[PDB]
Design a binder for this molecule. Structure first.
Ligand code: B3N
Ligand code: K
Ligand code: K
Ligand code: ZN
Length: 361
């Protein structure tokens, strides 16, 4: 039907308080509203996740400590400290984002929509009892566990710059959820996991697909790799629902300065997934050039709505942040692509061999 847009003014205000991305949620929604895209979507207010719902993946012990420090020596033991500081109210922030993704997943299984959007979600590094990489709660896993009540095989596609290790670890032992992550992979780069030989464990073996990619990849080659993998994944795995993480830290201009992507390339990967006509949960999380992240997700929202957007950024609250040209398009950086053609073919062929075992159920 009409895409569902998870939004409430209190929810965006909560997401703006994250120290790593101040006011990014307001910038994203303000630009989407500036293009009047919210009038073409069904606005759904997100609920706050309960302790029972967060406990479907996270352990009690980790959730108790998170709730205590939210209002300590054992904080480092649960991954709280450096990348994830235990600030006041951090448990309610986690429950808010986790509940937003659960809400979007609930809309999918109720037949209310075929696409549900929660751009502020997709924190894919958190483990069942350990925070990691700015992630205290793994709302992506919680969203998958909610769709799992109705859909038998769920495909998780992680297009963030970083490896989605938390989601992959959560389902590394099952064949009922397949994780596919395209990410920068280089010794020293966070989180350091997700080589192409990472395929899963036990009965989940060959149901974890990882595409290690080097710096400087652009739209054309990226869609070549993504369409090649998604085509083989769709025919070998035959999914019934898709969870799509679209972190914008791959876009040119991001301080990560690794990939050299534009939203047009990500949108072509998104169009290929929407053509499957499946229930699709859209997440974001990643993105540290605030204006470029709003640019990307606004463009991707238009791709979902099938609309073509005006190049000029309309005047709004955060208009001054869209220099230097104040247009929606993003120009790739003039730096080399470090992806050798023979290395990419070697990675794709290795994945093709792994997926042949999936065609032998
Ligand atoms: C300049 N400065 C203080 C820092 C710069 C980079 C990092 C970092 O990458 N840390 C490793 C954790 C990265 C997790 C990124 C989360 C993400 O986007 N996942 O997709 C840390 C501090
Ligand atoms: K990824
Ligand atoms: K798996
Ligand atoms: Zn990232």
């Amino acid at each position: 039907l009409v895409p569902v847009y998870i939004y409430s003014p209190e929810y965006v205000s909560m997401c703006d308080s994250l120290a790593k991305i101040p006011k990014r949620a307001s910038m994203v929604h303000s630009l989407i509203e500036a293009y009047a895209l919210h009038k073409q979507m069904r606005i759904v207010k997100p609920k706050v996740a309960s302790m029972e719902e967060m406990a479907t993946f996270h352990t009690d012990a980790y959730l108790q400590h998170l709730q205590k420090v939210s209002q300590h020596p054992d904080s480092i033991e649960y991954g709280l400290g450096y990348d994830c500081p235990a600030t006041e109210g951090i448990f309610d922030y986690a429950a808010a984002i986790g509940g937003a993704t659960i809400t979007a997943a609930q809309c999918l299984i109720d037949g209310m929509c075929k696409v549900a959007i929660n751009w502020s979600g997709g924190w894919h590094h958190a483990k069942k009892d350990e925070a990691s990489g700015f992630c205290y709660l793994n709302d992506a896993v919680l969203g998958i566990l909610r769709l799992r009540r109705k859909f038998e095989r769920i495909l998780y596609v992680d297009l963030d710059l970083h490896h989605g290790d938390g989601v992959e670890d959560a389902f590394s032992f099952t064949s009922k959820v397949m994780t596919v992550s395209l990410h920068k992979f280089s010794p020293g780069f966070f989180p350091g996991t997700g080589d192409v030989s990472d395929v899963g464990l036990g009965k989940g073996r060959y149901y974890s697909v990882n595409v290690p990619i080097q710096d400087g990849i652009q739209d054309e080659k990226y869609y070549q790799i993504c369409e090649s993998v998604l085509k083989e994944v769709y025919q070998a795995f035959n999914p019934k629902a898709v969870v799509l993480q679209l972190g914008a830290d791959t876009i040119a201009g991001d301080p990560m300065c690794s990939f050299n992507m534009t939203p047009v390339g990500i949108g072509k990967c998104l169009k290929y997934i929407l053509q499957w006509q499946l229930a699709t949960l859209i997440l974001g999380a990643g993105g540290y050039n605030l204006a470029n992240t709003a640019r990307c997700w606004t463009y991707l929202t238009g791709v979902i709505l099938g609309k073509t957007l005006s190049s000029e950024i309309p005047d709004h609250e955060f208009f001054t942040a869209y220099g230097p040209d104040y247009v929606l398009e993003i120009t790739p950086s003039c730096r080399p692509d470090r992806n050798e053609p023979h290395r990419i073919q070697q990675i794709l062929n290795y994945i093709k061999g792994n997926l042949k075992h999936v065609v032998i159920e």
